[PDB]
């Protein structure tokens, strides 16, 4: 029942230019019942999150602190 912190685990990715934290349903029961995924992105100025994609999850990205140039590729 207790709450949890997004940084209670080691970053999935923790480069020199940035860090991404991620808590997945297979690791937490509260998110399991909702089938939700949470992650905390941290990046230095000038750093780039290389092109990639997620296989099943649709991420709602919330800008909390700073500005980010994001490039999204879709097929219409």
């Amino acid at each position: 029942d207790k709450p949890f912190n997004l940084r209670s685990r080691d970053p999935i990715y923790s480069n020199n230019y940035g860090k991404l934290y991620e808590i997945t349903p297979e690791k937490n029961s509260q998110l399991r019942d909702l089938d939700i995924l949470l992650n905390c992105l941290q990046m230095n100025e000038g750093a780039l999150f290389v092109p990639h994609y997620n296989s099943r999850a649709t991420v709602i990205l919330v800008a909390n602190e700073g500005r980010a140039e994001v490039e999204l590729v879709g097929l219409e």
């Binding site: 029942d1 709450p3 949890f4 912190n5 997004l6 509260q30 998110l31 909702l34 709602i60």
Partner: protein, 178 residues
């Protein structure tokens, strides 16, 4: 333009006094048919200043609560007890739909920013809040109950209930902590 982008000005104001605010993101499937898989989710943003408390209310959806900035005292109320939680920046907590709760901002210095991710199910894409208190926004839902019904329930004179429970106290759902 772009159907996947949602600027901060796409958040509607539920309530906003000189103590804080509650914002609601429009429905993801509002202007575009490409986000139909996100129709049951709603994003809200709770913003309040030092020594303030969001009054008692329960919502009809499950809420993933996320503290984006500051610390908070989330108190979840059960029918057989209450559970107190000291929410710290970076902490998340799911609030079971229907659990009454109040949020408190204890720090006297910095503000409080919270993200509530809403998972709807009773009426997909819609989120409602039932505040047990009465204000200028709306009066305690207990007040909608007929005169006789409220007297038998609480076993007391009407004017006394209207006196203790039903009348308007503060002006908003967010009040300053004495």
């Amino acid at each position: 333009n772009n159907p996947y982008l949602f600027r901060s000005n796409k958040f509607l104001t539920l309530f906003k006094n000189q103590h804080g605010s509650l914002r609601l993101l429009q429905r993801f499937n509002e202007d575009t048919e490409k986000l139909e898989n996100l129709r049951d989710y709603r994003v809200l943003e709770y913003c309040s200043k030092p020594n303030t408390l969001l009054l008692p209310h329960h919502s009809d959806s499950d809420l993933l609560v996320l503290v984006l900035e500051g610390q908070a005292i989330l108190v979840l109320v059960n029918p057989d007890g209450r559970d107190t939680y000291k929410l710290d920046q970076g902490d998340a907590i799911k609030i079971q739909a229907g659990t009454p709760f109040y949020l408190i901002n204890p720090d006297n210095n910095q503000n409080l920013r919270i993200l509530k991710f809403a998972i709807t199910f009773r009426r997909p894409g819609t989120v409602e809040d039932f505040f047990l208190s009465s204000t200028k926004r709306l009066p305690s839902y207990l007040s909608a109950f007929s005169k006789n019904f409220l007297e038998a329930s609480y076993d007391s004179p009407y004017d006394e209930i209207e006196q203790t429970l039903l009348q308007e106290e503060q002006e908003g759902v967010i009040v300053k902590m004495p």
